[PDB]
Design a protein around this ligand. Sequence first.
Ligand code: GDP
Ligand code: MG
Length: 173
Amino acid sequence: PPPSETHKLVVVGGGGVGKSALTIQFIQSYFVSDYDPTIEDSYTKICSVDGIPARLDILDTAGQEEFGAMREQYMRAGHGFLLVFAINDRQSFNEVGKLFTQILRVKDRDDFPVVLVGNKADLESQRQVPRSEASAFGASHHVAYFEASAKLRLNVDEAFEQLVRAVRKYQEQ
Ligand SMILES: Nc1nc2c(ncn2[C@@H]2O[C@H](COP(=O)(O)OP(=O)(O)O)[C@@H](O)[C@H]2O)c(=O)[nH]1
Ligand SMILES: [Mg+2]
């Protein structure tokens, strides 16, 4: 039952990058390889980060294009964003640039809680975005970057946990 340790988190990124697979890994701790791309759902997880309990309300977006809500709605409501691309899809990496610019336009500041996730780390030979390039993009935006694999449950908890940290330090203002 935490108090202002209740955080509305939004998972955003291009289709097919692993938003559902990542979110389901965090909530359910197993890999779903074929999650209905049309389903946009919110989840809740109560968990401890840095020794402090937190209520996390996580929206797994299906995109505004066909199936989901207009993004400005949940982008305004969101307390923190998990910005996902896939390391074997440069177009998905371009899409996170666009999403980042939109978030900071909606918040009217360049310092809102965001964590960058490059998913599908298990497909190293298929990489299209160098780790150094993705890292630079994160650094230039003052955010943490994780390479994750929803398939192998690598850096799933760690990415979401870091996002909670960013939201906390932000609202220490
Ligand atoms: N190899 C690999 N494939 C993944 C990973 N995460 C998701 N996928 C695959 O990527 C596709 C899209 O994943 P999904 O969770 O539906 O992505 P979403 O559209 O962003 O919600 C599916 O075919 C998944 O099996 C991963 O970590 N590694
Ligand atoms: Mg999905």
